[PDB]
């Protein structure tokens, strides 16, 4: 999708663009701003040599899954729990990305509403 239709047949300035997002400071919404955590260190992540695109905040569960796969090799369906954990953590990453997109969208909405209200007040 609906956001495609909203951006392309509605108002382009109403919705964010994915290339330049985010356009607003992180602390504009709330000043708490807790930081994200990383479990796997640089050296162990390099030693597992996962991938450059697989070196995200999801890496510890990926390393555990690879450990299971190497350890219980012939029983190729033994460690399903590790696969579930890795999938769930990827799901949490994706939902965080969706939340960021929604936050940017509504921040732009309020910015445009504030601009329109200020223009109305100036005209009055």
């Amino acid at each position: 999708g609906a956001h495609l239709a909203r951006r392309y047949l509605g108002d382009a300035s109403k919705e964010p663009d994915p290339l330049r997002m985010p356009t607003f400071p992180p602390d504009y919404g709330f000043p708490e701003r807790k930081e994200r955590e990383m479990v796997a260190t640089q050296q162990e992540m390099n030693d597992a040599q996962l991938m450059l695109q697989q070196r995200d905040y999801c890496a510890h569960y990926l390393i555990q899954l690879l450990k299971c796969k190497r350890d219980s090799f012939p029983n190729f369906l033994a460690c399903k729990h590790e696969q579930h954990d890795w999938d769930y953590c990827e799901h949490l990453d994706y939902v965080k990305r969706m939340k960021e997109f929604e936050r940017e969208r509504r921040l732009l909405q309020r910015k445009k509403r504030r601009e329109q209200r200020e223009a109305e007040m100036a005209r009055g």
């Binding site: 479990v39 260190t41 162990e44 040599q49 510890h60 190497r70």
Partner: protein, 63 residues
């Protein structure tokens, strides 16, 4: 018997020749055979120097 003589004259002899050639001639020169460095995961023993890898940062486990 035909399968035995086939597996002898077709698999065993070429594999003998190739193993001899690789082990005693090709590997005599540097960088001719290069192997991917094996993956190292935390908690691994490591045979060459006998040094263990420390475990990870005990991530909060739930679901």
């Amino acid at each position: 018997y035909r399968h035995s003589i086939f597996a002898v004259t077709h698999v065993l002899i070429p594999v003998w020749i190739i193993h001899y050639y690789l082990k005693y001639h090709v590997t005599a020169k540097p960088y001719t055979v290069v192997e991917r460095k094996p993956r190292i995961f935390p908690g691994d023993t490591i045979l060459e120097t006998g040094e263990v890898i420390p475990l990870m940062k005990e991530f909060p486990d739930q679901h």
